[PDB]
Symmetry: C2
Subunit: 436 residues, 2 copies
């Protein structure tokens, strides 16, 4: 039968027993059964290179394409594997041909992943101004209605400047901070307004239900290596059949390109020589998660609940609060943010008008001068690795540090309590000016 | 004591199937057992400490592999980075070039260019909406070095005669099919004289021939470490002199290092371009070390494989009674791969007839002729036979009505392997003369 969750499940993984993994959402990790699968695929590749790599690669790709589309509840003709989420997002933006009038505009939110945000910048530079972009600022904790309204005002405002809102990139779950984004509402608005919905669901498969069919996005990308126990360097790229014709070239351009099984699926089979073993392990990771663990829903059910209750314990230990809106829809994933018990001094260049609640929440804590914010930020990162042998990413949002913790099926309440007590003393030492 | 002798005794150090004969190392390469173990050690370290290792040890390990490969190529370390493969870095060059506003820029390339790279030109023309064009330069092999230089000098001229401007030339170090050493020293020099960006595709390069980077001084060069440098698949070194690093505006794909308009920003840009297993990149310093301490260094490795390619190639040509692909100057087989014609002719195609050299018509009289339509049928048949029954693999170039089989020598091969290749290809070719491919 299935195995119980918690620290006993560390038996199945290959983490350092001295190292606490509180940040699975960044790079992921794989259990011992999947690494051996990974290395098994390599031995076959090095045993007879041309026979295996030329003819067994498409068979092993389609076995994982079938398993992942199955689990996503979508046709197999619509899923394909790319290197990673940054690669997939780049594949969408680099392939779109923009209107000849030059009125097209890319809409995005300021919680966009750094790599994604800078891809929009370069594409605008590369196409030399035939497409532009407008940034939608977000204040967190964000109410879902405020996010969708800020998107509607961006659509309305863009048209008042003579611009055409052409494409919108929507997170499933944002990176920093790790919050569930109301992507269903934003994608639906994109359809009504005829906007290409480029759903960046890197924090997606294996953690939250993507609801691909009912949402019907134009493009979706998601990192299997982030929450599906898939070896590093694997993202599932979803393109409906109606849109596969605009993905004209892969990244990079390879043999499958035709100058002007489907041709769309075949073009991604060989895109330059790479170790494709992480792709082949998708079918095993899915089968391992269903047989060894209780299944996909049981995995997500535990991680989300542990993120709530575990995050609330870190907040009690710190005397602060988790990051959540009035409807409790931000912590609908496996990650949770907790505010740290201090505050940064005001930036005279870009001062943030603090909200009355955010100011009473500052309640006379220790204040780090803004000139020392980056210095203390580096210190907390190094100390968490060198002294506590863990790693906690922190979002600097409105002169506060929001530490993001990632729950997993091999963690339990004791880990988040250790995380709370660790962060507690770490901030006590930040309060004493130890970062200098 | 001393280094290890070459030949089949060296297979103890590799992880090939003993029932499989790897006569085609040039396609995907392979790694020794010591390098595979290093690949898994980097893999083990990443899973033990995802964030601490991948965030902070990746800079260090990339820099050790950058210094190792830069010293091997005798190149400043500030001018080398690592990309995914040869196809990836050729795209990196062609997609960052800002073409001139009027639209006369054209990309020069030869028709023996690698298939992915030529189509990369076709897509860049499409994505840039016709402001850049291409001009294919046909080549006939056996090609003389003077004739290649002549075709390039006359293609530059026909361009400007049409009011066009040669902007960039895709130049091979060693071409894929047929596996042949290309006179890149002269074509790169002519690109400097004619103000043409030299984009060198040296995928067949590192670990096999002397790239002579400092001397020929190219604008951009790529080379597959995983092809001939015993590096795990998914690795290729990207050489750009710092005079041209500003031209690479964004990596492929675009990531944190891009900036809109100690370690240089160019070098920093290629460290994190998306979540990937970087174990192949880290092994570059381990492969170069292994090749030095165990095999005796690049120059002993390279010249053995080039010597074996000639002698073993003429054995296959002798066993089959044909010939090898070589020019009058003996400059085509200046690498580790050799092309030997198979003993039969393809019927002429009325859709594009091959008017052949007098000497070319004398080399095929008496040979069994296969009709042109059945050519692709027997081509697919020979591939399946050499794998399912002879348990090997040999790629074949179709060029002017004769198949040239491309063999790949390597430190773990010797003369008995090429004798087996010739013996295997006669059994194969005698069976296509009897029409077995039906």
């Amino acid at each position: 039968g299935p195995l119980p969750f918690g620290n006993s499940l560390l038996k199945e993984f290959v983490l350092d027993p001295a190292y606490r993994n509180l940040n699975h959402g960044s790079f992921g990790t794989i259990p011992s059964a999947i690494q051996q699968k990974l290395r098994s695929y390599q031995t076959a590749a090095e045993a007879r290179p041309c026979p295996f790599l030329r003819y067994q690669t498409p068979v092993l790709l389609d076995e994982s394409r079938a398993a992942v589309a199955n689990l996503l509840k979508v046709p197999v003709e619509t899923v394909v594997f790319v290197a990673n989420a940054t690669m997939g997002v780049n594949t969408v933006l680099r392939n779109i041909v923009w209107s000849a009038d030059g009125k097209d505009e890319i809409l995005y939110f300021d919680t966009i992943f750094g790599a994604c945000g800078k891809t929009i910048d370069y594409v605008i530079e590369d196409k030399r101004g035939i497409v532009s972009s407008r940034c939608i600022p977000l204040i967190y904790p964000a109410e879902d209605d405020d996010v969708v309204a800020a998107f509607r005002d961006a659509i309305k405002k863009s048209r008042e400047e003579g611009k055409r809102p052409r494409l919108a990139v929507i997170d499933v779950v944002s990176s920093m901070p790790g919050v569930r984004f109301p992507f269903e509402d934003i994608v639906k608005i994109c359809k009504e307004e005829e906007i290409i919905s480029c759903v960046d669901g890197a924090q997606g498969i294996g953690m939250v239900d993507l609801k691909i069919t009912e949402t019907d996005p134009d493009f979706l990308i998601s990192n299997c290596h982030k929450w599906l126990f898939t070896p590093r360097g694997c993202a599932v790229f979803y393109v409906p059949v109606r849109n596969q014709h605009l993905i004209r070239s892969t990244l990079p351009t390879s043999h499958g390109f035709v100058p002007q099984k489907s041709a769309f699926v075949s073009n991604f089979e060989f895109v330059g020589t790479v170790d494709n073993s992480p792709f082949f392990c998708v079918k095993d990771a899915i089968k391992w998660r269903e047989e060894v663990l209780g299944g996909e829903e049981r995995i997500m059910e535990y991680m989300t609940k542990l993120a709530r209750e575990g995050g609330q314990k870190v907040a009690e230990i710190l005397g602060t609060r988790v990051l959540e809106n009035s409807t409790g829809t931000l912590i609908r994933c496996a990650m949770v943010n907790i505010a740290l018990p201090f505050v940064v001094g005001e930036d005279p260049k870009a001062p943030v008008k603090l909200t009355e609640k955010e100011e009473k929440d500052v309640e006379g804590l220790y204040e780090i001068p803004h000139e020392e914010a980056n210095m203390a930020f580096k210190w907390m990162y190094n100390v968490l690795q060198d002294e506590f042998n863990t790693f906690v990413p922190m979002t600097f949002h409105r002169r506060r540090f929001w530490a993001r913790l990632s729950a997993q099926v091999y963690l339990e309440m004791s880990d988040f309590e250790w995380a709370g007590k660790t962060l507690k003393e770490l901030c006590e030492r930040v309060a004493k000016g130890e970062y200098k």
